[PDB]
């Protein structure tokens, strides 16, 4: 479509399509200002369209090129009103499919756009790239893409875009690993799959709506709900609840660890209960004399070891907030 | 559809359709008995249908709404046989898209209904008001609905329904009561989005399908997994597991603390592990003399403070089940 406005109705579009081996794109709404007039499209309905094996983009639902158009866009909202790669088109997008693409499978720009049910798979190059800023998306699936490893993304967002539901990873993807998702400025939720936390780079990731947590071990002999901060490192946990079986499996006895990472070695400091079926608490202590900056908690005591006296002592921070050293254990 | 029964064949329906500005509902099965004879519809197939900008619902798939609250319902089963908002309509419901609704975008009633793949986005009013009872709603995306706050929530369920998967939180979210989902009689599992627990009012919220999982934090200097009971208080935790970085980020050492609520003030009493790189556990104690109702666990000991002695003393409940007060540490 070249310079089509479906107006109020949203009349015009394509429902049902297949394209094989386009030299450009199978389904396109053209971008930039062509000549002194606009080629940009508005208000079109796109459902059940398919473009397989494109040389470049499979789908282009954009309206703005990488280079800026002439100022105060003709026939459209100005460049001042909406910066580059922002301008509402109000296209409706559902049920797209791409297989095998040398180029990208999917790409668009705009602001105020609403997108659902995008599927791209199998791809030699990228599954997805976006130019979008401040757009909404749902239910994106990028599987297997970059088989022959020709870009290092599989999905990219440049925006502040808010997205829910992302499922990833074929048999073998990413580039040899180098971010499935690079979108450091976008808030994305619903990221799940066999994707690694070192394949994820986003601005914020959380999913706090989930109920009571239950973890099931399959392919593992340990059960954990790990906590990881990615400013700490994306390969180092910041804490975890570990449960490891004492003795062989089926014993019915296991120890639960409340752990904190130290020195970049996980389970360096562990508070264990029922450790090797003791039925007691194995509590760590400082291997050297306790410092005054190792305790900040009123009405708590930090046990420490004194090698010199061969006795376990406690640095007690009272509810008075003052420090006093007591002898905790001596034979 | 006025008085259409597709029978066991499931004939009739709407497939491959786009509707714009209906003064009632774009695709509508008429509610209850209208006219001398029934207008209620059974066994119709709705797939790949789009309703853009309906005044009310885009898909009104009910048939038992506001008509005949009395003992007999004409051309239909009595209200004694099936309560109001319950009928075995058995419509085939998959792949439906609603956008632009001024009011509620989706509504239906019935029992034994199985609903899948419903995406309602960019609506001025609510995404769904579900008058269904004993119906299953699978793969539901309610994103950026109730953005003018006519209603009080993005999605409402009056009855008890089973919702497997949900996606909440768009680029804007509700503030008409600030409840993202108010559906206090429905049991919802798998809520996706960064929606706060206090903004979720549901009958039962639990997960039992998740495996061994890792929590990922981005844009946060802490990873928090919080344990919250909303009978206790909606906005206050009953316990939480925090992991905060020791010193600056990238250290590779982070202290994990286990917190509990006391006095209605969260993180009042905590047990810290690896507190400021000490590799020892902080053991809290009672700021006053321990009570004999505080500890009731055989083979456990509760430390307590006595100010005049300036010495730790621990009330020990022996494995004999008898209490003895021994001095834990001496000055």
From Swiss-Prot, chains A, B:
The active site is at 24, 57, 60. It is found in: Virion. Structural component of the short non-contractile tail. The tail comprises six spikes that mediate primary attachment to the host cell lipopolysaccharides (LPS) and display endorhamnosidase enzymatic activity, hydrolyzing the alpha-1,3-O-glycosidic linkage between rhamnose and galactose of the O-antigen polysaccharide. Digestion of the LPS brings the capsid near the cell outer membrane. Homotrimer. Interacts with the host O-antigen lipopolysaccharides; this interaction induces cleavage of host O-antigen. Interacts with tail hub protein gp10; this interaction anchors 6 fibers onto the tail hub hexamer. The interdigitation of the polypeptide chains at the C-termini is important to protrimer formation in the folding pathway and to thermostability of the mature protein. Belongs to the P22likevirus tail fiber protein family. This is Tail spike protein. It comes from Salmonella phage P22. The gene is 9. The chain holds residues 337 to 667 of 667 of the full protein.
């Amino acid at each position: 479509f070249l310079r089509n406005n479906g107006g109020f109705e949203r009349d015009g579009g394509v429902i049902g399509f297949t394209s094989y081996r386009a030299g450009e794109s199978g389904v396109k709404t053209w971008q930039g200002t062509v000549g002194s007039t606009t080629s940009r499209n508005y208000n079109l309905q796109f459902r059940d369209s398919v473009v397989i094996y494109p040389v470049w983009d499979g789908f282009d639902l954009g309206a703005d090129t990488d280079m800026n158009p002439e100022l105060d866009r003709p026939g459209d909202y100005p460049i001042t009103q909406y910066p580059l790669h922002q301008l509402p088109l109000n296209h409706l997008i559902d049920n797209l499919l791409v297989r095998g693409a040398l180029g990208v499978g999917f790409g668009m720009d705009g602001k105020g756009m609403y997108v659902s049910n995008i599927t791209v798979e199998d791809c030699a190059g990228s599954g997805a790239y976006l130019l979008t800023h401040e757009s909404v998306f749902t239910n994106i699936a990028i599987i297997d893409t970059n088989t022959k490893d020709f870009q290092a993304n599989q999905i990219y967002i440049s925006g502040a875009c808010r997205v829910n539901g992302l499922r990833l990873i074929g048999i073998r993807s990413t580039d040899g690993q180098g971010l499935t998702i690079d979108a450091p400025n976008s808030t994305v939720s619903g990221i799940t799959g066999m994707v690694d936390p070192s394949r994820i780079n986003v601005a914020n990731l959380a999913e706090e709506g989930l109920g009571n947590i239950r973890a099931n071990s399959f392919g593992y002999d340990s059960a954990a709900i790990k906590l990881r901060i990615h400013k700490l490192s994306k390969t180092l946990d910041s804490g975890a609840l570990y449960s490891h079986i004492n003795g062989g499996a089926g014993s019915g006895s296991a120890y639960t660890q409340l752990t904190a990472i130290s020195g970049s070695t996980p389970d360096a400091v562990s508070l264990k209960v029922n450790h090797k079926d003791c039925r007691g608490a194995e509590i760590p202590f400082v291997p050297d004399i306790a410092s005054d900056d190792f305790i900040k908690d009123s009405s708590c005591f930090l046990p420490y070891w004194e090698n010199n006296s061969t006795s376990l002592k406690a640095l007690v921070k009272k509810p008075n907030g003052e420090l006093v050293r007591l002898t905790l254990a001596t034979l």
